[PDB]
Amino acid sequence: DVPMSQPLKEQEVREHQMKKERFDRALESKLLGKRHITYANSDISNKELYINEI
Amino acid sequence: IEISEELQNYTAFVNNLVSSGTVVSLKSLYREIYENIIRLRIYCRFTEHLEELSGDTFLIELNIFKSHGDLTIRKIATNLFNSMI
Amino acid sequence: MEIKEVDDRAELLRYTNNIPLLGKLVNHQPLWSTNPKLKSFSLEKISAPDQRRVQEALVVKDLLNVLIGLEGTYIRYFNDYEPSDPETPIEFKIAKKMDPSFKTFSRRIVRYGKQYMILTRAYEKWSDTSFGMVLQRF
Amino acid sequence: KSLKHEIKELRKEKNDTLNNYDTLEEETDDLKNRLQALEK
């Protein structure tokens, strides 16, 4: 019948957890992050089957 | 010595086929020596640079080939690696 | 069928640097289009309903040879087939003077022959080390 | 790159020659059939 508010204990718990998470994310970013992204620059070859020209 | 053992096994197998009198068409013969052609291909591609390599380099290459998915290539590499080791 | 004179030397391949580990090391036999070893006995001469089984037997022989990738007398590789190049396309062309029922059945069996060629070429290629042990076991 | 170019040109000439061969053989056979009728 009315637009009541969200829970209160849950709301404040979420606020505290968000503060902690923001702190941890800033700390990770300052440490160049623990996860990044890559592309492979080199491939294997075998001396039994070696190549130099076509 | 492993190469020679393989060659002797192949000769024995080919002679058993021929004198067995159970090959009656070239298609049947080619069917019988399919895996032996594969084995000779392996034994002839592994030892192309035999005069240009050292035993430990062979050991490294055979360690790389012992993880091959093809059970035949892995068998052959395991035998060669075991002798050299 | 009368013999033609061509040079057929079965030798190993000279350069094996771009050949997979299980790739074929011999060279390819002479193709019918360039080096036919027989004068093709035209099938129109056994199209009579009495000599129908003779043409049937010749087509069955060509089919048993195609089923392992070997072109027959009346079923041959098409023009763009280059046996040296391993990435070549694979199709068979069927003698146009063949009995139409035999042409239909022969196209059906040529499907399997081409599949055999492509699958043999496929495992030869995938026997390399750069493909991973899953593709190598496949 | 130059070797790959020459390969492509030679492959094309081969395919055209083979297609021409078949066209020519068909003409040749029609002539043979006409001749067999005439010599008979």
Side-chain angles (χ1 to χ4, degrees), chain C residues 54-116:
Chain C
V54 186
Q55 163 173 174
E56 176 154 56
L58 299 185
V59 174
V60 173
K61 188 176 198 75
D62 278 349
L63 280 182
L64 299 203
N65 278 312
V66 164
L67 278 195
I68 55 177
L70 303 174
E71 55 177 13
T73 305
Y74 308 105
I75 313 185
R76 318 186 172 194
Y77 310 131
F78 71 111
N79 288 325
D80 297 340
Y81 182 87
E82 185 59 78
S84 82
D85 170 21
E87 280 85 350
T88 176
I90 298 169
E91 301 189 340
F92 294 80
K93 73 186 169 198
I94 300 185
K96 42 190 153 71
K97 284 306 174 183
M98 199 189 272
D99 201 279
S101 46
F102 298 159
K103 287 191 286 185
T104 305
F105 283 107
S106 286
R107 284 195 280 260
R108 282 179 208 160
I109 306 300
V110 161
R111 195 182 48 223
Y112 308 134
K114 151 180 179 172
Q115 287 184 353
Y116 167 91

Side-chain angles (χ1 to χ4, degrees), chain C residues 33 79-80 82 85 96, chain D residues 11 14-15 18-19 26:
Chain C
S33 86
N79 288 325
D80 297 340
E82 185 59 78
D85 170 21
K96 42 190 153 71
Chain D
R11 285 178 183 208
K14 176 176 167 174
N15 289 340
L18 291 170
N19 289 342
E26 291 175 359

Side-chain angles (χ1 to χ4, degrees), chain A residues 20-31:
Chain A
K20 301 212 298 187
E21 163 73 7
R22 286 203 299 270
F23 170 81
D24 270 347
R25 294 210 223 99
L27 181 82
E28 305 303 327
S29 292
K30 186 60 186 173
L31 191 42

Side-chain angles (χ1 to χ4, degrees), chain B residues 21-75:
Chain B
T22 62
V23 284
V24 298
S25 195
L26 296 191
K27 296 190 167 59
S28 189
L29 183 81
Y30 170 63
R31 193 185 65 80
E32 302 291 326
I33 63 185
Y34 207 101
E35 194 76 26
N36 288 82
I37 291 159
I38 294 298
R39 291 176 52 87
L40 297 166
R41 276 169 193 175
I42 299 156
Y43 273 99
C44 185
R45 296 279 271 157
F46 280 179
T47 80
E48 286 182 352
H49 306 290
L50 188 37
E51 73 267 25
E52 198 207 90
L53 283 193
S54 46
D56 46 348
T57 61
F58 284 104
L59 274 187
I60 301 318
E61 307 307 317
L62 293 181
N63 254 319
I64 289 169
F65 277 121
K66 279 168 59 194
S67 304
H68 216 287
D70 173 284
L71 303 200
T72 292
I73 286 171
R74 148 188 295 171
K75 279 182 203 159

Side-chain angles (χ1 to χ4, degrees), chain C residues 27-73:
Chain C
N27 55 348
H28 211 275
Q29 85 264 2
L31 313 188
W32 272 90
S33 86
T34 75
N35 291 92
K37 285 225 211 167
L38 307 174
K39 184 174 80 72
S40 179
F41 172 89
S42 67
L43 280 177
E44 71 189 30
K45 307 179 186 176
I46 42 184
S47 69
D50 292 330
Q51 310 275 285
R52 166 177 211 73
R53 191 147 153 89
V54 186
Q55 163 173 174
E56 176 154 56
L58 299 185
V59 174
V60 173
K61 188 176 198 75
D62 278 349
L63 280 182
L64 299 203
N65 278 312
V66 164
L67 278 195
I68 55 177
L70 303 174
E71 55 177 13
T73 305

